[PDB]
Copies of this chain bind each other. A is one copy, B any other.
């Protein structure tokens, strides 16, 4: 399961998206240490603040199943460049993923930006601050 294959997983996950308000579908694929893949997609609500992102869906899914050790996260959306995770998602990612997990950001045109969880949100607010 290389990053290209994980990207294909995220591209498939994207098609499950429930985004009738923004019409902006996002897909995510989370790869665990053991090689299992969890797909995620954004799920919206008439009350916008309740919308849930693809990255979060995938992580919530994995964690709820007892899978907490990840190696890579791919995210895909039809954006100009590699899709940029929103601040809230970066926060969830920084909490649920170890700092060296690889985050693969892409769009639907082959643009690829790869970074670590740490780079995704440097000095991210964390439990240590509490």
Contact = CB atoms under 8 A, between A and B. Distances in A.
A16 B92 CA distance: 17
A44 B63 CA distance: 11
A94 to B, nearest CB: 7
A49 B49 contact: yes
A85 B125 contact: yes
A1 interface: no
A56 interface: yes
A99 interface: no
B46 A21 contact: no
Contacts of A58: 64
12 contacts: A18-B96, A40-B60, A46-B125, A46-B129, A49-B86, A50-B86, A52-B56, A58-B64, A84-B124, A84-B125, A86-B91, A87-B94
